[PDB]
Amino acid sequence: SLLKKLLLA
Amino acid sequence: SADLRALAKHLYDSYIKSFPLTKAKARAILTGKTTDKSPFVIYDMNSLMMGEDKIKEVAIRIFQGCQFRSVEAVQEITEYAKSIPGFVNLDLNDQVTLLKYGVHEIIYTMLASLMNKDGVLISEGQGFMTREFLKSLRKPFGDFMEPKFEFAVKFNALELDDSDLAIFIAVIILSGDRPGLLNVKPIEDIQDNLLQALELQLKLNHPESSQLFAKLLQKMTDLRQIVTEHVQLLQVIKKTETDMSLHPLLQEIYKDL
Ligand SMILES: CCCCCCCCCC(=O)O
Secondary structure (H helix, E strand, O other): OHHEEEEEE | OHHHHHHHHHHHHHHHHHHOOOOOHHHHHHHHOOOOOEEEEEOHHHHHHOOOOOOHHHHHHHHHHHHHHHHHHHHHHHHHHHOOOOOOHHHHHHHHHHHHHHHHHHHHHHHHEEEOOEEEEEOOOOEEHHHHHHOOOOOOOOOHHHHHHHHHHHHHHOOOOOOHHHHHHHHEEEEEEEEOOOOOOHHHHHHHHHHHHHHHHHHHHOOOOOOOOHHHHHHHHHHHHHHHHHHHHHHHHOOOOOOOOOHHHHHHOOOOO
């Protein structure tokens, strides 16, 4: 879920 | 071909924006051709102590430092991936999958830029840790870096520059065989175009390096073996060493994987 957060920034 | 060169340039510009320490800057530091520096050399326990302010037993302190560097690199690589044309339009779960299974292959590729046969630049080029020192650490810790040095010396013999590396790293990120990808076709279509751009880059920038494109395709396979071996060492740490756990971003990346 942390990768998804980095991708969306 | 003109669009392939524009793509190569776009990727290089995006690589320069994403990665503060490039190969060109690292090689300058390593060969002593820069105005500033030099890096602080860590070659034994005493110099480690003297230098620790740039930036629990020693082996574990080093392993922890390396996790934080890995986490920083994941963030840089994620920014770069978002600059590859088409990538942000992929299904978001597939973007996550490509990063999860690709980022360490990219970390080891880029780590080679910071290495010579004698050691590795650390802390954005402010330190230099010797290969011999890292090998001296107790098992399994002394086994982590050595295969990465072995890879690097052979990879560095290809003499790639940052323009070449920017395309090579993009090719690796866009690998359509990663486990659990939902829609492989658009990923393969982007990768095919990146592979065409890589082939033309190498023909123009390394005209006398016969089969360099073939050699890079082999290094992509080699990187997968380096990751497999690394995961096996991480498993040894998990089974022994009660003390330790991974940073949450690395826990995600290594979850099953
Ligand atoms: C203490 C010896 C240095 C080895 C550190 C290895 C860091 C690996 C973390 C990662 O897989 O992202």
